[PDB]
Design a protein around this motif. Structure first.
Motif, PDB file in Angstrom:
ATOM      1  N   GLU A  47      -9.236   5.596   6.785  1.00 38.68           N
ATOM      2  CA  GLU A  47      -8.759   6.501   5.744  1.00 38.68           C
ATOM      3  C   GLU A  47      -8.759   7.951   6.224  1.00 38.68           C
ATOM      4  O   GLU A  47      -9.657   8.378   6.945  1.00 38.68           O
ATOM      5  CB  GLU A  47      -9.613   6.357   4.482  1.00 38.68           C
ATOM      6  N   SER A  75      -8.923  12.056   6.351  1.00 42.02           N
ATOM      7  CA  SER A  75      -9.913  13.031   5.914  1.00 42.02           C
ATOM      8  C   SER A  75      -9.633  14.360   6.599  1.00 42.02           C
ATOM      9  O   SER A  75      -8.865  14.432   7.560  1.00 42.02           O
ATOM     10  CB  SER A  75     -11.335  12.564   6.223  1.00 42.02           C
ATOM     11  N   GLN A 117       1.586   5.172  -1.119  1.00 48.14           N
ATOM     12  CA  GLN A 117       0.734   6.351  -1.142  1.00 48.14           C
ATOM     13  C   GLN A 117       1.179   7.418  -2.128  1.00 48.14           C
ATOM     14  O   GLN A 117       0.340   8.208  -2.570  1.00 48.14           O
ATOM     15  CB  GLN A 117       0.666   6.978   0.256  1.00 48.14           C
ATOM     16  N   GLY A 144      -1.902  11.037   1.548  1.00 44.88           N
ATOM     17  CA  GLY A 144      -3.181  10.361   1.429  1.00 44.88           C
ATOM     18  C   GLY A 144      -4.298  11.368   1.224  1.00 44.88           C
ATOM     19  O   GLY A 144      -4.146  12.363   0.506  1.00 44.88           O
ATOM     20  N   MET A 145      -5.436  11.100   1.864  1.00 45.43           N
ATOM     21  CA  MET A 145      -6.627  11.955   1.852  1.00 45.43           C
ATOM     22  C   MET A 145      -6.950  12.449   0.439  1.00 45.43           C
ATOM     23  O   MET A 145      -6.807  13.621   0.092  1.00 45.43           O
ATOM     24  CB  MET A 145      -6.513  13.107   2.858  1.00 45.43           C
ATOM     25  N   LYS A 146      -7.358  11.488  -0.386  1.00 47.22           N
ATOM     26  CA  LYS A 146      -7.889  11.803  -1.703  1.00 47.22           C
ATOM     27  C   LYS A 146      -8.965  12.876  -1.601  1.00 47.22           C
ATOM     28  O   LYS A 146      -9.725  12.935  -0.630  1.00 47.22           O
ATOM     29  CB  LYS A 146      -8.457  10.542  -2.346  1.00 47.22           C
ATOM     30  N   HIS A 196       0.850  -1.191   0.000  1.00 46.42           N
ATOM     31  CA  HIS A 196       0.000   0.000   0.000  1.00 46.42           C
ATOM     32  C   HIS A 196       0.886   1.242   0.000  1.00 46.42           C
ATOM     33  O   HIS A 196       1.109   1.893   1.022  1.00 46.42           O
ATOM     34  CB  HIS A 196      -0.944  -0.007   1.193  1.00 46.42           C
ATOM     35  N   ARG A 239     -12.764  13.312   0.283  1.00 45.99           N
ATOM     36  CA  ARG A 239     -13.085  13.074   1.685  1.00 45.99           C
ATOM     37  C   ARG A 239     -12.728  14.284   2.533  1.00 45.99           C
ATOM     38  O   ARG A 239     -12.056  14.182   3.559  1.00 45.99           O
ATOM     39  CB  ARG A 239     -12.378  11.829   2.204  1.00 45.99           C
TER      40      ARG A 239
END
Lengths: 89, 71, 21, 156, 114, 208, 105, 114, 208, 114, 114, 95, 89
Positions: free
Chosen positions: G53, G55, E61, G86-88, E59, G91
């Motif tokens: 996930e 946010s 990123q 992260g945090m597409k 995974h 969200r």
């Protein structure tokens, strides 16, 4: 790994063990001097009376710093695990 | 010479209580339940409890050694 | 998958023994 | 059960050796084996197993859960019996060593260290000579306890 | 005067997480210092996002950056200028493919996708 | 469909060959030996109890604590199979289930989660996880549990040793080794409290 | 000015989890400080939800008048989404002082 | 003037990663020096990104660079000049083939893609 | 012209004969076993976890971490072979390819360099090297990697041992052995850190 | 005069990496000193990049260099001059075949690519 | 006067690496001193490039040399002179077949390829 | 040694019988193996002696140096790359 | 091998430990001497007092010479390896 990584790891443990032992033996060392100056004031040459004050204060240091020392070592165990991929990279 | 004698004298009476202290610590730490074993926090609490309960009788005996040493 | 490989082999032997008997 | 008895004497040998500032279990193991042979212990065990055929038939019958727990509780039997045999000697070992320590504590220059090693081992061997002098009576009482356990297993 | 953090001795006992954070901070500082030399921009604030990579787990990123540019009183950045900005910010930091850079300004107009 | 007599015999002999593994990987043998290993190590005796009697006592202790599960296997699986009530395939499954239930009673949720993700499989109920994944989680929990019990058993012997050392130092004799004096006291306090019987209660009853 | 958390030296008393939370807090403060430089927004408060996930939730107090069009909120949400690992960008919750929603989650 | 770091002595406070950073910084500084003596360039600032180039047989990360230049008061660099800049920077640092260099200017015109 | 059925069986029976060699040399078994060995010696316990349990844990771990390559062999070399789609010679190559790739991900280029020169073959790309050269390079890399992980886990137990010895020497009780008192703390740290679950997870995650 | 580093004594606590860097710096200093003896050359600065030499091609790194020069007030380097410079630099340092040496100038005209 | 380094006693703090560099420096100094004994040569400095070697290795470096000298006020070296220089240089140092010497002059005329 | 023991008349070593060479070859290999082993034993012995004396200096005569020395013994074999250095020397010892 | 070669190897090994051990203990030896003089100056005799300074100084000595000890050991191991072909013949 690299020779420098070993020295980094070696120093960190040496710094850790130094801090772990210093917190306990510092109070006993000071009490030893306090008993020593007391025996210098009364001129008594007995050398076994000082054992009890050091032992009592040592347990007091263990009780006061027990949680902090255990947490420090436990986080240190996690820290080596976290840096394990870095070494194996 | 005097310090060791008084310690033996202290072990005559304080030692019996110290034997009771050791008896209780071994009895408790041996008789564990399923709930106590599976909880790490409970083990440390008994470890501290057994530690502190030891200190008081031990301190009295060593104090009996210290007091005679000065005298 | 790979786990079912042993199961299939034993069943074939059992079927061969059953038909032979 | 037979292994439990002999190893308990091996326990007796090593506790004396450990307290003697020190292979001594082998000395007790060999002598206890002689006790087992001289007292016809092997014949009694053979008599026990044939008696087991009578009172514990082959077809219906096996060791229950209680038999397993009784046999698992023999570790406490080892320590209690080993301590009982050595309690007199172990007190003697401690008191002479404590007496030697306090008597030579006047001058901290002497100390004991290796000098204490020599003194402790000489007395410890001497005490083992006393232990072998009265060990037979302890073995007889120990065998009675063990034999009773065996008959309990075979329900005799 | 960004590299001051590196040239300090960073004391001792600083955890690995904290060291990574301070290194990223120094990187942001020197990038912002470089961008200030742009004639168009008056103030710049640079934020980095570098994941843990860690080929032992699959995974991943991938990295990202966001640069806010409080520009001059007037004037606007042409396509060439913003493309040069994103190219510089991308090539300065390891990884961070140039398609994950967000460029904004005080007027609130977005200049590069994410 | 059911396995032939020749094939059932082959399976029976195979499980007998793996019998030592089932004792030390599926039953309670691992926890008992580790705990008894700590007890020997805690006292001043190094090899004095010897390895033979510890394993023999551990085997008898396991047969004591595995008696409920072994009897449950006997009733549910062996009895219908002997009476030819059920086929061999279902009898084998009927024997596997009590072992799986016992291993679940001695494992932890965190251990199962690690290995089920490690195996890369899909499951939602712990009750129907494959025994191939339950075994590593079972022993991992057993080793952690045994260390907990052993740590609690080690404390009273450490308590006795520290007291004796402090007493000797306080009396001024900085020359005598605490181990020789402390050993009879540790053994005496192990006997007059009947320590092994207490350990039996906290070890045999620890499974439930 | 949020970086003062980073450049400050943590006493030995702090332990991991507190350190991670302090890192996140520094990120939040510096993000808010960056957002303030926009002409329209006067105050901003940013919260993050990063699993150990991810946010974000950014509240804005705008000027006395004015309302953010889709473009401005797009710029804000994209900047926050790209700044944090992260945090597409799907969200993030964006709100305002009057409670009108600007980004669902 | 860049060599100040190398000829300096790190105390036992430093730790692995930090050491690496300072080494890189030195290169940047001396590389900046190399650009300064050009007539056209008035100020230079270099940022590098050198990954680990890991042992074992995995694929590596293709190191990158970004050099910002404030040129003379006027003047516009020729293609030969930017070519010389990128060649020197690429050959100065191990790996990092010439196609990983972003060169920008004070006015903001991009001079080499990334 | 694939190998005849009689020769195909003879080849497969030979591979089962070398099954211990394949596990102990071509797989992850060695690294896990060595790391467990270092950890056991790091603490005061000599052989408390016992050798059979250590190997038993490693066997399950080495099966789980190699499930992806095991499945890749099945999906590319076994199923096409059983469905009569690939020549037996091709299927053997299709099974060997994922195994070679996995061993290359966990090997060091220095190990390949010395063995390639040792074999004296002119090969440049580090993907078309023979198994005769790859296997010694792989096992050498696994031993070195295990030592690095073993040293990493050893340090915290060394820290405890030094602290206990230093504290005892502070009180002047030099005669007291630090090892007997150190051991319960070594068990203490390893159990509240959840060591058993932690180490097996890291060992599983190490192979990547 | 570059030999100061070599004849000196490294203080206890110099990381191995630092020793390699200082050896590289020493070689750079003596190369610059040799180049400064050139009549056309007034100032010289040398940067190096060491190899790895793995038999595998895909992991081999190969050595390189980058030398900047400020020449005299007039005059420009001929083909013979640059050939002599590159040959000296190449043969002074292990590896680094003559095809990977970048030579630039104060005016910035490229004299050798990499 | 080159032999001073060898006859000295190296104190603590020098490593295998520094010792090897100092041995090479001694050889370079004595070779330059012997070269200066020729009338045409006025000032000289020699650089060497020697791999780690060691038996039981897979060396792929091979040796190299580079002698630089500034001659008298006039005069030009003949091919015979440079041949003598290269032959003594090659035969003095182990390895370094005579085809790996770069000889330059004060004015930059190359006298031996690499 | 074996030529005189076998009682044969040998003029040159390069023509000795096989039955007199095999015992001699394995004898030399064992002796050569011991010499190489002594070389490798010294660095680990030095570490053990160093750590033992340091512990004794601080007054702790009850802590076993073997436990303390073990992490450093492993590290010395790692950063020197022992498993590549030792095997290359063993292979190179037949050339 | 020749007996003289064995003594050479034996001497350089003993010299290696002597240099290594003295660099670590000499700092502790001086501190212990300093504390003893100070205790004599104030007429006190506490055996356990001069333990904290020695332990800390020794740990500091180990940290300071971490790179030096590693470099010395690594070069010594390489030296024996390179000296091996000289012996075998």
């Amino acid at each position: 790994m690299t020779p420098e990584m070993f020295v980094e790891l070696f120093r960190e443990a040496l710094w850790m063990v130094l801090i772990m032992v210093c917190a306990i033996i510092i109070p006993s060392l000071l009490i030893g001097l306090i008993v020593a100056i007391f025996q210098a004031a009364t001129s008594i040459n007995e050398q076994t009376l000082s054992f009890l004050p050091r032992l009592i204060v040592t347990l007091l240091a263990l009780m006061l710093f027990g949680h902090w020392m255990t947490q420090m070592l436990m986080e240190y165990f996690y820290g080596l695990i976290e840096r394990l991929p870095q070494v194996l990279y | 010479a005097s310090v060791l004698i008084v310690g033996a004298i202290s072990l005559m009476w304080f030692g019996e209580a110290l034997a009771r202290s050791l008896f209780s610590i071994m009895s408790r730490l041996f008789d564990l339940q399923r709930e106590e074993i599976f909880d790490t926090a409970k083990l440390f609490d008994i470890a501290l409890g057994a530690m502190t309960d030891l200190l008081f009788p031990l301190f009295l005996v060593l104090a009996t050694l210290f007091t005679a040493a000065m005298i | 998958d790979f786990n079912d490989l042993l199961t299939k082999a034993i069943n074939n032997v059992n079927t061969l023994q059953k038909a032979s008997g | 059960v037979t292994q439990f008895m002999i190893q308990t004497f091996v326990l007796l040998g090593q506790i004396l050796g450990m307290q003697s500032s020190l292979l001594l279990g082998q000395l007790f193991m060999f002598l206890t084996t002689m006790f087992f042979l001289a007292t016809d212990g092997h014949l009694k065990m053979l008599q026990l197993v044939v008696f087991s055929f009578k009172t514990l038939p082959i077809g219906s019958g096996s060791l229950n859960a209680v038999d397993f727990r009784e046999m698992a509780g023999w570790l406490g039997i080892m320590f209690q019996t080993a301590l009982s045999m050595s309690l007199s000697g172990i007190i003697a070992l401690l008191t002479i060593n404590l007496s030697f320590g306090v008597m030579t504590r006047a001058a901290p220059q002497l100390n004991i260290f290796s000098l204490g090693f020599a003194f402790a081992l000489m007395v410890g061997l001497l005490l083992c000579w006393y232990i072998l002098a009265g060990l037979y009576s302890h073995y007889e009482m120990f065998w009675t306890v063990g034999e009773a356990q065996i008959c309990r297993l075979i329900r005799l | 005067a960004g590299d001051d953090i590196l040239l300090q001795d960073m004391g001792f006992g600083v955890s690995q997480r904290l060291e990574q954070e301070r290194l990223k901070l120094s990187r942001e500082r020197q990038l912002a210092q470089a961008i200030e030399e742009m004639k168009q921009v008056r103030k710049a604030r640079v934020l980095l996002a570098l994941p843990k990579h860690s080929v032992f787990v699959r995974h991943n990123q991938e990295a990202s950056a966001s640069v806010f540019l409080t520009l001059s009183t007037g004037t606007n950045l042409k396509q060439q200028e913003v493309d040069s900005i994103v190219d510089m910010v991308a090539s300065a930091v390891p990884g961070m493919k140039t398609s994950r850079i967000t460029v904004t300004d005080q007027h609130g107009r977005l200049l590069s996708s994410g | 469909e059911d396995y032939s007599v020749t094939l059932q015999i082959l399976a029976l002999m195979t499980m007998l060959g793996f019998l030592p593994a089932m004792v030390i990987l599926m039953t309670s043998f691992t926890r008992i030996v580790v705990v008894m290993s700590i007890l020997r190590q805690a006292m001043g005796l190094q090899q004095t109890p010897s390895n033979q009697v510890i394993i023999g006592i551990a085997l008898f202790l396991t047969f004591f604590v595995m008696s409920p599960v072994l009897n449950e296997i006997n009733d549910k699986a062996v009895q219908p199979y002997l009476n030819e009530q059920v086929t061999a395939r279902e009898a084998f499954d009927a024997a596997q289930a009590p072992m799986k239930a016992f291993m679940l009673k001695q494992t932890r949720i965190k251990d199962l989660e690690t290995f089920v993700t490690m195996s890369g499989e899909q499951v939602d109920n712990p009750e129907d996880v494959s025994m191939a994944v339950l075994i590593p989680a079972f022993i991992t929990s057993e080793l952690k549990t045994a260390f907990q019990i052993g740590f609690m058993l080690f404390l009273p012997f450490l308590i006795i040793d520290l007291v004796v050392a402090s007493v000797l130092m306080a009396m001024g004799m900085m020359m005598l080794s605490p181990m020789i004096v402390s050993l009879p006291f540790k053994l005496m306090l192990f006997v007059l409290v009947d320590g092994w019987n207490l350990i039996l209660s906290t070890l045999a009853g620890s499974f439930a």
